[PDB]
Ligand binder design. Sequence first.
Ligand SMILES: CC(=O)N[C@H]1[C@@H](O[C@H]2[C@@H](O)[C@@H](CO)O[C@@H](O)[C@@H]2O[C@@H]2O[C@@H](C)[C@@H](O)[C@@H](O)[C@@H]2O)O[C@H](CO)[C@H](O)[C@@H]1O
Length: 578
Amino acid sequence: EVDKRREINNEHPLLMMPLYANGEEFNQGKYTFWGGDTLTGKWENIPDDLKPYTVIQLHPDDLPKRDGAARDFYEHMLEEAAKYVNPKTGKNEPIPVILTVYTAGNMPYYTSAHWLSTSWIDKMYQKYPNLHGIFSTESYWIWANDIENKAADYLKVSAKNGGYFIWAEQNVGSAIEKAFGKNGKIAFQKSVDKYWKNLIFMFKNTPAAEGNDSTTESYMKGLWLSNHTYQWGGLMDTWKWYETGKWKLFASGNIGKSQGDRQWLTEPESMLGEEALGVYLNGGVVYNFEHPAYTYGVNNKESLLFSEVIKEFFRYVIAHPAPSKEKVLEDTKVFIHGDYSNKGNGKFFVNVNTDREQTPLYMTGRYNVIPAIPGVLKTDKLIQIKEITSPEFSSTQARKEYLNKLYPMNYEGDIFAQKLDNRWFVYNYKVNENVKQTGKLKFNSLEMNVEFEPHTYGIFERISNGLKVNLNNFRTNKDSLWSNAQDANQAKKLPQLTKKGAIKWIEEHYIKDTQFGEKRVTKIVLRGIDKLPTIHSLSGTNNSYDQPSLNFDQKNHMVTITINSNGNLEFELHFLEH
Ligand SMILES: CC(=O)N[C@H]1[C@@H](O[C@H]2[C@@H](O)[C@@H](CO)O[C@@H](O)[C@@H]2O[C@@H]2O[C@@H](C)[C@@H](O)[C@@H](O)[C@@H]2O)O[C@H](CO)[C@H](O)[C@@H]1O
């Protein structure tokens, strides 16, 4: 094996930092990105603690669809990245880069990436030590006749140079199954047999109306556990709100795919953290997001979604490495072999661990994510390994009856919760319904009851001297975007915000003059404690929380903690048990 250019694993996770080429400005002789970020400026603005775990991902977006455009733009930016000088130290510190090399089947009518040869990619790897990988994203809807062959070549050229091939794809139209040879195109299967240590496979949750979130994530996890990918992760996309026809938060009615640039701004910020937990809690280590203007920011400035949710989440997964492959393997009780495409796709998990067909969330952590690999792959080398065609998986009820025998019930209440070591992870799983959820969790004899509004997650760690709490319910008010529409009919008919309009809205009304959401209440009740706990190390989003209220009831050895907040929040409670 050629020495790897970087590590990507639980201890060295990866946050991809997208920069999308501005093709309109390219036609005017400029080298710029949509949203006004610059390569150097974006890198400089990444906190120094995150720099070792963050890589700039260039994307060719709307560069002209002709030979040379993407090479020109990419060479220009690789040069900028290579020559970067840290102004504090005066040292040349080449900026790490991933290039988007394949998208939309690389059709010449869809992308400038068509004209990026494997020869050119090899040349770039050899010229730029700071080129750490190449990225393929979103071809499920245009499954080119040579897509598997090209993916093999991308993986091989990456392995040859110590780089990673990273593929973000969703199991629409059997995409993941076909990638590994379902329909007889086996070149990528064979490449992975050799070069899996240089592959990263990610979900891409954009096509939310097709409901393949749970099954794609199941495959990413199973491919990883079975050594068909070095690591896995996910690209979580606020465009899901567009794809599913939602509009104003909690409003009635569906507007369809009619207001895209308003719609990709509307997903609650903290919901991205809820999605990301599904990656982390299942051993995934690679994270990416769209739309970049909302999820990361503009003009080399962090959006509040980035600063209050994504940045803090990513810091958490660096501080608490995700469960290792070995650990996840030990914990896996059932591993599915076969094609979700033959068993209802995402419907497979509805009312097993998802609450509806179109959601990126889970309603229980009891089974965590059940890992699977497509039927084309083998289970010889790879726990009960079960064919997807088994009677145990024939119906919703059968699945639960079987899984429940192997995965015991470990909490109470209609809420998402999952436990790792001494940590309960909890979130309200409602997507667009304004409904509180409650759960009862235990740390041995200590009882913790929680009440969460939608778009709220928490991490509760039993430490020797009490409990460490991380809470995030950050959700700004997007109603301005939907003003002048009292119903779905009117909302569908609003003037288009447009891409440029949405970027400008972020600049003028999100980066500044933000319409923050209202503070809202979280309740935490601890039963079985000796004395009034003390609170320590309280911090969170500025101006976003009231001082927590602790009400201790001596007779019943319990405390009720009431929090009123809208943001990220951390604190410790110190106490002993009774
Ligand atoms: C047409 C358009 O608005 N393009 C911008 C938009 O692109 C994404 C959306 O159109 C989304 C709707 O669900 O569909 C996605 O396919 C699309 O993603 C882009 O194209 C695909 C083929 C891939 O190349 C993706 O990597 C790419 O983002 O939003 C993105 C930013 O999220 C860009 O501004 C597009 O210009």
